[PDB]
Amino acid sequence: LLAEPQIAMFCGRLNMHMNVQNGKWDSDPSGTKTCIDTKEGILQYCQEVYPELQITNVVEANQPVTIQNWCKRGRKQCKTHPHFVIPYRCLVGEFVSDALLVPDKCKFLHQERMDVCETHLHWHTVAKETCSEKSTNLHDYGMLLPCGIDKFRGVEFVCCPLAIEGRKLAAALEH
Amino acid sequence: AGLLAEPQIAMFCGRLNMHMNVQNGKWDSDPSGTKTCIDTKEGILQYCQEVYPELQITNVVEANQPVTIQNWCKRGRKQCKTHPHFVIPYRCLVGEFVSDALLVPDKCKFLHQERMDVCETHLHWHTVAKETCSEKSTNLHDYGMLLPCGIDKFRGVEFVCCPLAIEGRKLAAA
């Protein structure tokens, strides 16, 4: 398994999925599957595309990727017409939280509640607001404790200083 | 009802395989934009399963007559405007095998031959059918395979013989 299984969609075109052997995007195997509207449906598609793996849940990727050559159902031509989309990671087996890199002087934090079951977006906001409050930057975050298809009870994240001993601490991503 | 078109694949070396879109009845190119003509039955079978993931394809057999397929594609599917080609499709047989239903038109007869000791090709059986109608001064109108014994291998054939209706001739010579 040289790549993480995941699916990417763009309504109007056939779904794409990560080729776990080489690491490139391929198009829907049957040339018939279009964008999906529910988390339950996305999870099924993941399982249909990766029959050899035990897909047990799904979660949005933290950052968009650029995919080219989207095919259209019916059309012969898959025009290299780039699109920036947020893939869905097909999580496999027993759930384990993402390992996150903690750059020096940054802090690893996490929040959870046994009685809340929210989305990836909600947890992303929590993490962002928590770092923002302390006047810092959100460098990375991951979900914790799944409670449903693409639903979690918490978030683990990394907050970073605007600068260390005078020098600004930067990074680039997601837009 | 909500009946689908029989699944099948068509090849033309130097181009991407085509497969029948079972939902609209029209041909589509290779989903991955990389698969090309195959040279083994086992390979044909594997390709069927690949483009028809939701069907239990358990065998393959050549269709009886070639078909005209427009706009083939080259690897990558960036250039697909081309000259139509006459190719003989491969039927992707699903699930449990059952003999095709043959229409016996007026004045024709339905015959079938099965040899439980042999395991021949589609071509062999087509010939056995053609020759059997010839021996009775008739013409082979249609046929289908019987008793599968391997990937695209059968133990028999069912066919329909019909009146020749052909203009013969002789020679007037000195």
Side-chain angles (χ1 to χ4, degrees):
Chain A
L1 202 55
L2 292 58
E4 169 171 57
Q6 65 200 76
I7 66 102
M9 307 178 276
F10 184 87
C11 294
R13 298 293 172 290
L14 294 181
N15 303 337
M16 289 272 189
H17 72 280
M18 178 61 72
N19 181 303
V20 293
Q21 288 176 60
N22 68 57
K24 299 292 183 177
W25 294 104
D26 304 333
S27 176
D28 174 49
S30 69
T32 56
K33 309 299 190 169
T34 306
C35 75
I36 307 151
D37 193 8
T38 81
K39 294 307 189 301
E40 190 181 313
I42 296 183
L43 171 56
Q44 300 174 308
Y45 191 58
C46 270
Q47 307 178 322
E48 212 238 343
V49 168
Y50 300 103
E52 198 173 300
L53 304 167
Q54 193 201 181
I55 304 312
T56 61
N57 202 331
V58 308
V59 63
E60 284 88 347
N62 285 349
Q63 57 291 297
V65 59
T66 5
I67 290 179
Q68 307 175 309
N69 304 313
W70 294 76
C71 304
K72 170 170 186 176
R73 193 168 56 67
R75 266 188 194 179
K76 292 262 167 36
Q77 254 210 301
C78 306
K79 59 181 180 180
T80 315
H81 177 326
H83 284 312
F84 212 44
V85 295
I86 301 167
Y88 276 96
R89 299 165 59 203
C90 299
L91 299 188
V92 325
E94 179 191 60
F95 182 89
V96 176
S97 45
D98 295 331
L100 317 174
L101 286 171
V102 177
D104 291 340
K105 305 310 180 180
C106 302
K107 266 76 180 300
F108 178 76
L109 310 177
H110 69 276
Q111 279 178 39
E112 35 195 283
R113 303 170 178 181
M114 48 74 217
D115 67 348
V116 315
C117 189
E118 287 281 24
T119 70
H120 174 263
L121 168 55
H122 169 89
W123 288 119
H124 175 186
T125 308
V126 159
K128 196 170 175 184
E129 304 190 319
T130 299
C131 297
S132 175
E133 273 160 26
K134 305 196 303 298
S135 296
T136 58
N137 296 306
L138 176 58
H139 177 68
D140 198 9
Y141 68 105
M143 304 296 93
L144 295 180
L145 313 175
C147 46
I149 284 60
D150 198 8
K151 291 281 219 145
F152 314 82
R153 299 211 188 286
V155 66
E156 50 161 359
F157 54 96
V158 168
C159 294
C160 287
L162 276 53
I164 303 180
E165 278 172 357
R167 28 210 188 194
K168 158 188 174 180
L169 199 255
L173 33 84
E174 312 163 6
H175 281 301
Chain B
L3 297 181
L4 307 171
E6 183 171 20
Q8 59 193 327
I9 62 93
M11 313 178 290
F12 183 92
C13 294
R15 288 291 144 130
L16 288 177
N17 300 342
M18 294 285 253
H19 70 271
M20 177 65 62
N21 182 293
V22 299
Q23 290 99 332
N24 54 39
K26 304 176 62 180
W27 296 93
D28 284 356
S29 191
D30 184 49
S32 65
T34 79
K35 305 290 181 170
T36 315
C37 75
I38 293 76
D39 77 300
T40 51
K41 306 306 184 184
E42 310 293 357
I44 302 280
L45 172 38
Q46 284 186 49
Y47 186 67
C48 275
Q49 307 175 318
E50 199 175 302
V51 286
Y52 295 115
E54 305 198 323
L55 300 171
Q56 207 206 316
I57 293 180
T58 57
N59 218 328
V60 294
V61 74
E62 300 92 321
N64 285 338
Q65 244 50 68
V67 184
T68 288
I69 304 172
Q70 293 163 53
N71 316 81
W72 290 62
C73 302
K74 279 173 290 300
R75 189 182 185 78
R77 293 178 54 176
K78 269 74 178 191
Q79 290 180 60
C80 303
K81 300 180 180 180
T82 89
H83 4 291
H85 296 170
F86 211 45
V87 301
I88 297 175
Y90 271 73
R91 292 169 54 185
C92 295
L93 305 182
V94 213
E96 221 190 312
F97 186 85
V98 177
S99 314
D100 288 334
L102 299 192
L103 196 46
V104 185
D106 185 24
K107 292 167 176 180
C108 313
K109 292 167 298 180
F110 175 83
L111 305 141
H112 63 270
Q113 191 186 316
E114 57 282 319
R115 310 244 292 208
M116 307 316 279
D117 64 358
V118 57
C119 184
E120 302 295 1
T121 178
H122 174 265
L123 183 79
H124 175 93
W125 290 122
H126 170 182
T127 306
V128 176
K130 202 168 199 180
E131 168 164 41
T132 292
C133 289
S134 271
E135 283 166 45
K136 296 188 311 308
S137 300
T138 53
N139 180 65
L140 178 60
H141 184 65
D142 198 20
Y143 62 106
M145 303 297 112
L146 302 186
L147 316 170
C149 53
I151 296 66
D152 203 347
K153 290 292 202 66
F154 314 80
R155 295 190 190 296
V157 64
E158 61 175 9
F159 51 109
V160 177
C161 297
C162 290
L164 298 172
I166 284 286
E167 179 62 355
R169 72 199 135 258
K170 278 167 173 294
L171 179 77

mmCIF file of all heavy atoms in Angstrom, chain A residues 27-33 48 69 71 73-78 80, chain B residues 18-19 21 23 27-28 31 50-51 53-54 70-71 73 77-78 80:
data_model
loop_
_atom_site.group_PDB
_atom_site.id
_atom_site.type_symbol
_atom_site.label_atom_id
_atom_site.label_comp_id
_atom_site.label_asym_id
_atom_site.label_seq_id
_atom_site.Cartn_x
_atom_site.Cartn_y
_atom_site.Cartn_z
ATOM 1 N N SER A 27 -9.964 7.307 -12.651
ATOM 2 C CA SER A 27 -11.379 7.647 -12.699
ATOM 3 C C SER A 27 -12.259 6.440 -12.343
ATOM 4 O O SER A 27 -11.783 5.300 -12.338
ATOM 5 C CB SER A 27 -11.721 8.191 -14.087
ATOM 6 O OG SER A 27 -13.106 8.434 -14.191
ATOM 7 N N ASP A 28 -13.533 6.692 -12.031
ATOM 8 C CA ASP A 28 -14.444 5.617 -11.660
ATOM 9 C C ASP A 28 -14.321 4.429 -12.601
ATOM 10 O O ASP A 28 -14.560 4.543 -13.802
ATOM 11 C CB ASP A 28 -15.884 6.106 -11.638
ATOM 12 C CG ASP A 28 -16.866 4.978 -11.403
ATOM 13 O OD1 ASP A 28 -16.658 4.179 -10.466
ATOM 14 O OD2 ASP A 28 -17.854 4.884 -12.155
ATOM 15 N N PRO A 29 -13.955 3.267 -12.055
ATOM 16 C CA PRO A 29 -13.762 1.993 -12.758
ATOM 17 C C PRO A 29 -14.846 1.578 -13.759
ATOM 18 O O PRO A 29 -14.539 0.971 -14.791
ATOM 19 C CB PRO A 29 -13.626 0.985 -11.615
ATOM 20 C CG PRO A 29 -13.018 1.804 -10.523
ATOM 21 C CD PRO A 29 -13.806 3.085 -10.601
ATOM 22 N N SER A 30 -16.102 1.893 -13.460
ATOM 23 C CA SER A 30 -17.191 1.519 -14.344
ATOM 24 C C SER A 30 -17.584 2.659 -15.278
ATOM 25 O O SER A 30 -18.435 2.493 -16.152
ATOM 26 C CB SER A 30 -18.398 1.114 -13.515
ATOM 27 O OG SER A 30 -18.946 2.245 -12.863
ATOM 28 N N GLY A 31 -16.965 3.819 -15.084
ATOM 29 C CA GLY A 31 -17.277 4.975 -15.907
ATOM 30 C C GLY A 31 -18.724 5.415 -15.770
ATOM 31 O O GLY A 31 -19.288 5.961 -16.713
ATOM 32 N N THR A 32 -19.319 5.206 -14.592
ATOM 33 C CA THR A 32 -20.724 5.553 -14.361
ATOM 34 C C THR A 32 -21.053 6.351 -13.096
ATOM 35 O O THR A 32 -22.074 7.035 -13.042
ATOM 36 C CB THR A 32 -21.601 4.278 -14.319
ATOM 37 O OG1 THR A 32 -21.103 3.389 -13.315
ATOM 38 C CG2 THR A 32 -21.566 3.562 -15.653
ATOM 39 N N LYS A 33 -20.193 6.266 -12.089
ATOM 40 C CA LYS A 33 -20.417 6.940 -10.814
ATOM 41 C C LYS A 33 -20.102 8.434 -10.744
ATOM 42 O O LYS A 33 -18.972 8.858 -10.965
ATOM 43 C CB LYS A 33 -19.625 6.224 -9.725
ATOM 44 C CG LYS A 33 -19.851 4.727 -9.683
ATOM 45 C CD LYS A 33 -21.304 4.403 -9.417
ATOM 46 C CE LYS A 33 -21.484 2.925 -9.144
ATOM 47 N NZ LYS A 33 -22.853 2.643 -8.619
ATOM 48 N N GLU A 48 -16.635 0.280 -2.344
ATOM 49 C CA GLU A 48 -16.819 -0.333 -3.654
ATOM 50 C C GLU A 48 -15.504 -0.271 -4.439
ATOM 51 O O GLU A 48 -15.101 -1.255 -5.061
ATOM 52 C CB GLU A 48 -17.961 0.350 -4.431
ATOM 53 C CG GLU A 48 -18.728 -0.613 -5.372
ATOM 54 C CD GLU A 48 -18.737 -0.205 -6.871
ATOM 55 O OE1 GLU A 48 -18.443 0.966 -7.206
ATOM 56 O OE2 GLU A 48 -19.054 -1.069 -7.724
ATOM 57 N N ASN A 69 -7.821 15.886 -15.806
ATOM 58 C CA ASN A 69 -8.338 14.806 -16.641
ATOM 59 C C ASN A 69 -9.603 14.124 -16.143
ATOM 60 O O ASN A 69 -9.713 12.894 -16.179
ATOM 61 C CB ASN A 69 -7.241 13.757 -16.873
ATOM 62 C CG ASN A 69 -5.976 14.360 -17.471
ATOM 63 O OD1 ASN A 69 -6.039 15.135 -18.429
ATOM 64 N ND2 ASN A 69 -4.822 14.001 -16.914
ATOM 65 N N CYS A 71 -13.123 12.693 -16.353
ATOM 66 C CA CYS A 71 -13.938 12.177 -17.432
ATOM 67 C C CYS A 71 -15.404 12.498 -17.138
ATOM 68 O O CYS A 71 -15.775 12.753 -15.994
ATOM 69 C CB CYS A 71 -13.746 10.674 -17.545
ATOM 70 S SG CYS A 71 -12.026 10.101 -17.765
ATOM 71 N N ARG A 73 -19.495 11.183 -17.748
ATOM 72 C CA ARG A 73 -20.252 9.985 -18.095
ATOM 73 C C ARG A 73 -20.768 10.184 -19.504
ATOM 74 O O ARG A 73 -21.380 11.206 -19.806
ATOM 75 C CB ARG A 73 -21.421 9.765 -17.130
ATOM 76 C CG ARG A 73 -22.063 8.383 -17.245
ATOM 77 C CD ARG A 73 -23.014 8.085 -16.095
ATOM 78 N NE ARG A 73 -24.061 9.094 -15.959
ATOM 79 C CZ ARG A 73 -25.035 9.295 -16.842
ATOM 80 N NH1 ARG A 73 -25.116 8.543 -17.934
ATOM 81 N NH2 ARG A 73 -25.941 10.244 -16.627
ATOM 82 N N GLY A 74 -20.507 9.215 -20.371
ATOM 83 C CA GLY A 74 -20.948 9.345 -21.743
ATOM 84 C C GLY A 74 -19.847 9.829 -22.672
ATOM 85 O O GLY A 74 -19.588 9.184 -23.682
ATOM 86 N N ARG A 75 -19.203 10.952 -22.342
ATOM 87 C CA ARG A 75 -18.117 11.524 -23.162
ATOM 88 C C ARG A 75 -16.910 10.607 -23.303
ATOM 89 O O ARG A 75 -16.521 9.927 -22.356
ATOM 90 C CB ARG A 75 -17.609 12.852 -22.572
ATOM 91 C CG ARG A 75 -18.240 14.145 -23.114
ATOM 92 C CD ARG A 75 -17.482 15.378 -22.573
ATOM 93 N NE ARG A 75 -18.203 16.635 -22.783
ATOM 94 C CZ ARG A 75 -17.760 17.825 -22.391
ATOM 95 N NH1 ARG A 75 -16.595 17.931 -21.766
ATOM 96 N NH2 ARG A 75 -18.483 18.912 -22.624
ATOM 97 N N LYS A 76 -16.298 10.613 -24.482
ATOM 98 C CA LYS A 76 -15.108 9.793 -24.726
ATOM 99 C C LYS A 76 -13.887 10.528 -24.203
ATOM 100 O O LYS A 76 -12.979 9.931 -23.617
ATOM 101 C CB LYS A 76 -14.895 9.550 -26.228
ATOM 102 C CG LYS A 76 -15.926 8.671 -26.888
ATOM 103 C CD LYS A 76 -15.438 7.245 -27.018
ATOM 104 C CE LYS A 76 -16.597 6.350 -27.379
ATOM 105 N NZ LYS A 76 -17.533 7.064 -28.297
ATOM 106 N N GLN A 77 -13.886 11.838 -24.424
ATOM 107 C CA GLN A 77 -12.784 12.697 -24.031
ATOM 108 C C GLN A 77 -12.716 13.132 -22.577
ATOM 109 O O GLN A 77 -13.647 13.761 -22.067
ATOM 110 C CB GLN A 77 -12.801 13.950 -24.892
ATOM 111 C CG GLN A 77 -11.719 13.986 -25.934
ATOM 112 C CD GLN A 77 -11.291 15.404 -26.230
ATOM 113 O OE1 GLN A 77 -12.100 16.238 -26.644
ATOM 114 N NE2 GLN A 77 -10.012 15.692 -26.005
ATOM 115 N N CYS A 78 -11.606 12.803 -21.920
ATOM 116 C CA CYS A 78 -11.376 13.223 -20.538
ATOM 117 C C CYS A 78 -10.386 14.396 -20.650
ATOM 118 O O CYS A 78 -9.166 14.207 -20.549
ATOM 119 C CB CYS A 78 -10.737 12.099 -19.718
ATOM 120 S SG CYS A 78 -11.583 10.483 -19.719
ATOM 121 N N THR A 80 -7.968 17.375 -19.944
ATOM 122 C CA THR A 80 -7.092 17.788 -18.848
ATOM 123 C C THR A 80 -7.531 19.202 -18.475
ATOM 124 O O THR A 80 -6.900 20.175 -18.877
ATOM 125 C CB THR A 80 -5.607 17.847 -19.293
ATOM 126 O OG1 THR A 80 -5.279 16.677 -20.051
ATOM 127 C CG2 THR A 80 -4.694 17.932 -18.081
ATOM 128 N N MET B 18 -13.157 -0.719 -25.672
ATOM 129 C CA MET B 18 -14.466 -0.094 -25.568
ATOM 130 C C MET B 18 -15.297 -1.122 -24.813
ATOM 131 O O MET B 18 -15.009 -2.318 -24.869
ATOM 132 C CB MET B 18 -15.080 0.142 -26.958
ATOM 133 C CG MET B 18 -14.357 1.148 -27.845
ATOM 134 S SD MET B 18 -14.632 2.872 -27.366
ATOM 135 C CE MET B 18 -15.719 3.504 -28.653
ATOM 136 N N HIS B 19 -16.302 -0.658 -24.080
ATOM 137 C CA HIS B 19 -17.181 -1.571 -23.362
ATOM 138 C C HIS B 19 -18.561 -0.950 -23.491
ATOM 139 O O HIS B 19 -18.689 0.271 -23.649
ATOM 140 C CB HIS B 19 -16.781 -1.726 -21.872
ATOM 141 C CG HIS B 19 -17.042 -0.509 -21.032
ATOM 142 N ND1 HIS B 19 -16.114 0.498 -20.866
ATOM 143 C CD2 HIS B 19 -18.150 -0.109 -20.362
ATOM 144 C CE1 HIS B 19 -16.640 1.467 -20.136
ATOM 145 N NE2 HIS B 19 -17.875 1.124 -19.819
ATOM 146 N N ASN B 21 -21.958 0.484 -22.312
ATOM 147 C CA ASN B 21 -22.497 1.140 -21.128
ATOM 148 C C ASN B 21 -23.860 0.484 -20.970
ATOM 149 O O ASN B 21 -24.779 0.803 -21.709
ATOM 150 C CB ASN B 21 -22.656 2.641 -21.388
ATOM 151 C CG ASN B 21 -23.180 3.393 -20.178
ATOM 152 O OD1 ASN B 21 -24.322 3.209 -19.759
ATOM 153 N ND2 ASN B 21 -22.337 4.247 -19.607
ATOM 154 N N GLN B 23 -26.295 0.966 -19.185
ATOM 155 C CA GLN B 23 -27.434 1.824 -18.847
ATOM 156 C C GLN B 23 -28.051 2.591 -20.003
ATOM 157 O O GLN B 23 -29.256 2.842 -19.998
ATOM 158 C CB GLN B 23 -27.061 2.812 -17.733
ATOM 159 C CG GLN B 23 -26.852 2.173 -16.352
ATOM 160 C CD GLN B 23 -25.376 1.917 -15.997
ATOM 161 O OE1 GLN B 23 -24.523 1.708 -16.881
ATOM 162 N NE2 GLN B 23 -25.078 1.915 -14.689
ATOM 163 N N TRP B 27 -21.532 2.660 -26.604
ATOM 164 C CA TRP B 27 -20.175 2.265 -26.226
ATOM 165 C C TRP B 27 -19.383 3.390 -25.529
ATOM 166 O O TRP B 27 -19.519 4.567 -25.873
ATOM 167 C CB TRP B 27 -19.378 1.801 -27.453
ATOM 168 C CG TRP B 27 -19.900 0.576 -28.131
ATOM 169 C CD1 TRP B 27 -20.770 0.532 -29.178
ATOM 170 C CD2 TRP B 27 -19.583 -0.790 -27.817
ATOM 171 N NE1 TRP B 27 -21.016 -0.776 -29.540
ATOM 172 C CE2 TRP B 27 -20.302 -1.606 -28.720
ATOM 173 C CE3 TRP B 27 -18.764 -1.402 -26.860
ATOM 174 C CZ2 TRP B 27 -20.228 -3.000 -28.694
ATOM 175 C CZ3 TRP B 27 -18.692 -2.799 -26.834
ATOM 176 C CH2 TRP B 27 -19.421 -3.577 -27.747
ATOM 177 N N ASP B 28 -18.562 3.010 -24.550
ATOM 178 C CA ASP B 28 -17.711 3.939 -23.796
ATOM 179 C C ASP B 28 -16.267 3.438 -23.892
ATOM 180 O O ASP B 28 -16.026 2.246 -24.117
ATOM 181 C CB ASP B 28 -18.108 3.975 -22.314
ATOM 182 C CG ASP B 28 -19.377 4.777 -22.047
ATOM 183 O OD1 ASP B 28 -19.933 5.386 -22.988
ATOM 184 O OD2 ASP B 28 -19.813 4.802 -20.873
ATOM 185 N N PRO B 31 -12.189 3.140 -18.870
ATOM 186 C CA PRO B 31 -12.293 4.016 -17.698
ATOM 187 C C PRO B 31 -10.972 4.603 -17.201
ATOM 188 O O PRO B 31 -10.904 5.773 -16.832
ATOM 189 C CB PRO B 31 -12.966 3.115 -16.662
ATOM 190 C CG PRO B 31 -13.876 2.294 -17.512
ATOM 191 C CD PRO B 31 -12.948 1.898 -18.648
ATOM 192 N N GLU B 50 -13.354 -5.951 -14.548
ATOM 193 C CA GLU B 50 -12.814 -4.649 -14.213
ATOM 194 C C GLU B 50 -13.762 -3.488 -14.556
ATOM 195 O O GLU B 50 -13.945 -2.569 -13.762
ATOM 196 C CB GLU B 50 -11.481 -4.517 -14.938
ATOM 197 C CG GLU B 50 -10.506 -3.479 -14.435
ATOM 198 C CD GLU B 50 -9.181 -3.577 -15.199
ATOM 199 O OE1 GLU B 50 -8.561 -4.675 -15.171
ATOM 200 O OE2 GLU B 50 -8.775 -2.570 -15.834
ATOM 201 N N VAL B 51 -14.387 -3.536 -15.725
ATOM 202 C CA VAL B 51 -15.284 -2.459 -16.137
ATOM 203 C C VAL B 51 -16.728 -2.664 -15.690
ATOM 204 O O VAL B 51 -17.561 -1.765 -15.796
ATOM 205 C CB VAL B 51 -15.230 -2.278 -17.660
ATOM 206 C CG1 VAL B 51 -13.927 -1.591 -18.052
ATOM 207 C CG2 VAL B 51 -15.304 -3.632 -18.333
ATOM 208 N N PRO B 53 -17.590 -3.910 -12.387
ATOM 209 C CA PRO B 53 -17.344 -4.284 -10.990
ATOM 210 C C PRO B 53 -18.589 -4.781 -10.238
ATOM 211 O O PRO B 53 -18.489 -5.676 -9.401
ATOM 212 C CB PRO B 53 -16.768 -3.000 -10.397
ATOM 213 C CG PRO B 53 -17.453 -1.926 -11.189
ATOM 214 C CD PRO B 53 -17.349 -2.467 -12.589
ATOM 215 N N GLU B 54 -19.757 -4.219 -10.543
ATOM 216 C CA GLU B 54 -20.978 -4.639 -9.864
ATOM 217 C C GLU B 54 -21.674 -5.883 -10.431
ATOM 218 O O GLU B 54 -22.759 -6.221 -9.968
ATOM 219 C CB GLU B 54 -22.001 -3.493 -9.808
ATOM 220 C CG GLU B 54 -21.498 -2.198 -9.174
ATOM 221 C CD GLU B 54 -22.634 -1.252 -8.733
ATOM 222 O OE1 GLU B 54 -23.668 -1.154 -9.436
ATOM 223 O OE2 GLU B 54 -22.485 -0.587 -7.679
ATOM 224 N N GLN B 70 -17.777 3.772 -33.487
ATOM 225 C CA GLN B 70 -17.170 5.064 -33.789
ATOM 226 C C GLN B 70 -16.303 5.662 -32.676
ATOM 227 O O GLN B 70 -16.431 5.316 -31.503
ATOM 228 C CB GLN B 70 -18.258 6.077 -34.137
ATOM 229 C CG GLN B 70 -18.983 5.796 -35.427
ATOM 230 C CD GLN B 70 -20.287 6.559 -35.520
ATOM 231 O OE1 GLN B 70 -20.315 7.777 -35.358
ATOM 232 N NE2 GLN B 70 -21.378 5.841 -35.781
ATOM 233 N N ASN B 71 -15.426 6.576 -33.076
ATOM 234 C CA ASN B 71 -14.532 7.304 -32.182
ATOM 235 C C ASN B 71 -13.763 6.539 -31.129
ATOM 236 O O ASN B 71 -14.102 6.609 -29.952
ATOM 237 C CB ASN B 71 -15.307 8.406 -31.477
ATOM 238 C CG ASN B 71 -16.200 9.153 -32.409
ATOM 239 O OD1 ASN B 71 -17.294 8.698 -32.721
ATOM 240 N ND2 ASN B 71 -15.737 10.301 -32.883
ATOM 241 N N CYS B 73 -10.312 5.790 -28.828
ATOM 242 C CA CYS B 73 -9.359 6.680 -28.166
ATOM 243 C C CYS B 73 -7.965 6.092 -28.079
ATOM 244 O O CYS B 73 -7.788 4.866 -28.099
ATOM 245 C CB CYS B 73 -9.772 6.969 -26.729
ATOM 246 S SG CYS B 73 -11.385 7.725 -26.400
ATOM 247 N N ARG B 77 -6.953 9.201 -23.418
ATOM 248 C CA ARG B 77 -8.241 9.735 -23.826
ATOM 249 C C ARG B 77 -8.301 11.234 -24.091
ATOM 250 O O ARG B 77 -9.279 11.901 -23.734
ATOM 251 C CB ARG B 77 -9.304 9.318 -22.802
ATOM 252 C CG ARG B 77 -9.533 7.809 -22.829
ATOM 253 C CD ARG B 77 -10.527 7.328 -21.809
ATOM 254 N NE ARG B 77 -11.808 8.021 -21.894
ATOM 255 C CZ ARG B 77 -12.852 7.708 -21.139
ATOM 256 N NH1 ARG B 77 -12.742 6.703 -20.273
ATOM 257 N NH2 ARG B 77 -13.997 8.382 -21.253
ATOM 258 N N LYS B 78 -7.257 11.754 -24.735
ATOM 259 C CA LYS B 78 -7.219 13.170 -25.095
ATOM 260 C C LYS B 78 -7.625 13.345 -26.560
ATOM 261 O O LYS B 78 -8.185 14.377 -26.926
ATOM 262 C CB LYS B 78 -5.829 13.777 -24.867
ATOM 263 C CG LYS B 78 -5.630 14.388 -23.486
ATOM 264 C CD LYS B 78 -5.468 13.319 -22.428
ATOM 265 C CE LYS B 78 -5.235 13.931 -21.065
ATOM 266 N NZ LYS B 78 -4.822 12.902 -20.073
ATOM 267 N N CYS B 80 -9.909 11.391 -29.269
ATOM 268 C CA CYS B 80 -10.839 10.289 -29.538
ATOM 269 C C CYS B 80 -11.701 10.449 -30.783
ATOM 270 O O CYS B 80 -12.704 9.755 -30.924
ATOM 271 C CB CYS B 80 -11.798 10.056 -28.374
ATOM 272 S SG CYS B 80 -11.112 9.717 -26.727
#
